[PDB]
Ligand binder design. Sequence first.
Ligand SMILES: CCCC(=O)/C(O)=C/OP(=O)(O)O
Ligand SMILES: [Mg+2]
Ligand SMILES: [Mg+2]
Lengths: 408, 412
Amino acid sequence: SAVMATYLLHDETDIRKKAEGIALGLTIGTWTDLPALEQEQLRKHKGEVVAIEELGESERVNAYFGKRLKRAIVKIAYPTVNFSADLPALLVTTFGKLSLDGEVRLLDLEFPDEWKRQFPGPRFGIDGIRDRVGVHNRPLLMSIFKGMIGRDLAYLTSELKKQALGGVDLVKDDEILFDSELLPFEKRITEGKAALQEVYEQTGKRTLYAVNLTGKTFALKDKAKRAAELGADVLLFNVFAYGLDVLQALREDEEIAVPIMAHPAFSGAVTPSEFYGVAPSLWLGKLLRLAGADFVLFPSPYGSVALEREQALGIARALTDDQEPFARAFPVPSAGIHPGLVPLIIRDFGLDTIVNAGGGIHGHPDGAIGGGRAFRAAIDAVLAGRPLRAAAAENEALQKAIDRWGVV
Amino acid sequence: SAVMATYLLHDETDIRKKAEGIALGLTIGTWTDLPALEQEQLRKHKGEVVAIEELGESERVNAYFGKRLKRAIVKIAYPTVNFSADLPALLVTTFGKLSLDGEVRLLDLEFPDEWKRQFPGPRFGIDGIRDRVGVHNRPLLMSIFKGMIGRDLAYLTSELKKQALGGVDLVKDDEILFDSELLPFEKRITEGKAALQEVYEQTGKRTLYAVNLTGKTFALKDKAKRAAELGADVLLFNVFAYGLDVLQALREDEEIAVPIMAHPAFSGAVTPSEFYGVAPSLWLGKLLRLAGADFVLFPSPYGSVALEREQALGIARALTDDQEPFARAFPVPSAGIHPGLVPLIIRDFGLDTIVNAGGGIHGHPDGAIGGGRAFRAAIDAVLAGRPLRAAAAENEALQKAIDRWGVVEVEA
Ligand SMILES: CCCC(=O)/C(O)=C/OP(=O)(O)O
Ligand SMILES: [Mg+2]
Ligand SMILES: [Mg+2]
């Protein structure tokens, strides 16, 4: 039983030597200087290099570093009996001191099934979320509150109702919206709930509200429990500013049991480099799903703020792979999304994804209501196999959206 | 009142345009379309670009990216009224969505004094730690347990004694030593304490034990409190695997009040890039001190695993700057350290530093006892105004260390 870590290494020195040094140094330390009884005692704790795939040198990389760097994908096995069954221990064991060892980038982690079972996965997942939103035959649609910093509850409820009237399935606080005297956490929840209930009585559709869960770590469970009691729909959480273990703690608390939406804020401090950090499929995908996120937002491959296509697809794959012993998490490609991108979003991510937009909603000529209607029309058109311009002939909101941002 | 963030940007599009976009987009979002009444009401929340220092375009960077990238240092002011007084809010506000915006690297964060005061800083700091171990003037000496994974308490106590008999001031668990049936957290503390007092009884040397504080986040305060009750000397903490806010929580809990040693594990996932992440001086220095670390271990600028000299010095400066409303944190340059490096360590970091012999101390020809003796002899030599080799001629432990690893020249 061992967790196998896969790394990308760049080095001017022997990579196999370094890999072997890591496997031994980061597990039992030394081996050949150990007495007979001690070797049989520590054998189960000895790390091992599982494989080394040589990639050959890159002129571009060499030029950048001004040196000749050998490249390779290295796989190392760390016995699970070497650490406690928790994410902080996993990270320290597989990329603690090693993260400081020059050019080393963590690409993936693979675990025995028995080990994975010590973790929760999403509480609701795609199926649970669809049941709660009441939408099963199409991708979901979400809008983001914009310009709320410094505004009051009257403004919040007004803005919340407009987005809901646009037909969005969910509305989330912007991740930079923190608790204040004007907008207290509990008041956002209770007043938002009432406002959405009024819209529900007018349309028959109840839009869900993902409220930002912020503040100090040791106060999170208490307010999350209050959120559950007050009837909050979803908890938005900037997990990377805390720790993966905190997300897991929120997921495992039976007194919370509210869907959790993980935001990518600060994940960019770890994922972009070619030589360092942790790959996004693992950092935003595999680990967040395992830790308990029901939704995971990540930069789409389309906007100004984006991810390479295969990187984004890799995250979605990790979130939905049904071979994992966890519920599937909702992939939410984000940033700069507008109606004209709906055809591509569905083509790339399928039906089990969420169309998420802030400016794409509020920037519509007719406000949030028009913005939401344009998106709903675009989604229906794609599912029906109709070009957006054809569908726009029968939907003014979509026409205005297409005229403003175009079709991709 | 605003927090000023300093960023390094690489971009093929207008940097000033992007800067203004960040100041506005990450604060109030819109401004020009707001009526006079709303502007005056939201003015206090409006972010602003403070300065933009244009740097020379780099041929090396351009070749790497295969494009022409303009470079600049951008400073943005974020009103403190926009976010709550906690580190997670600070990070999300100054480098949340922005960390995803292409080539942007956070270099520094400047806080108004009034804001800093809502944070603890180290509980003990350099002065407090020196009093706890009873060592003034000279740099401290610390060693790390070797190969403890899979071992039992009898092995731990025997190994702990060897290190203390070598004269080290502090011994720390390896950061990858997690709790187990063989080595329970509380037992390491109590058995370790007994072993160290026995050593004091025979040699007169006082040695502290930094025990690894691990496990799930919400069980940390309970065990730290227990550690305090049991008299633990220092709590070693892999802060970067937990979040800066957790370190602050441990520091602010009056029922703990035990020195905290922050380990750099995982910080390398954030600090090394030339275009992304967060600079070491901020991530390992300024923020850890503010959060409550009494000691901060970081890659020294000497070994295989290291940091550029100015980078390492920058961390030490942030940890010890007397201009901050916080106690100074002990800088502990680590990795590759050996007796032959003591002169350079003291020349570079001064007397208020800790020589971290790490696990290498066990590699001395005569084991940890000889290894510690070699280090203590080297420290005394420098303080006595003598070359290591002069002292080596009178100290066999030091001579063996020099013969084994050599002496690093300090002459400029
Ligand atoms: C990748 C997450 C982006 C985000 O947090 C946000 O609020 C986006 O807004 P729009 O780009 O849709 O206007
Ligand atoms: Mg946002
Ligand atoms: Mg270690």
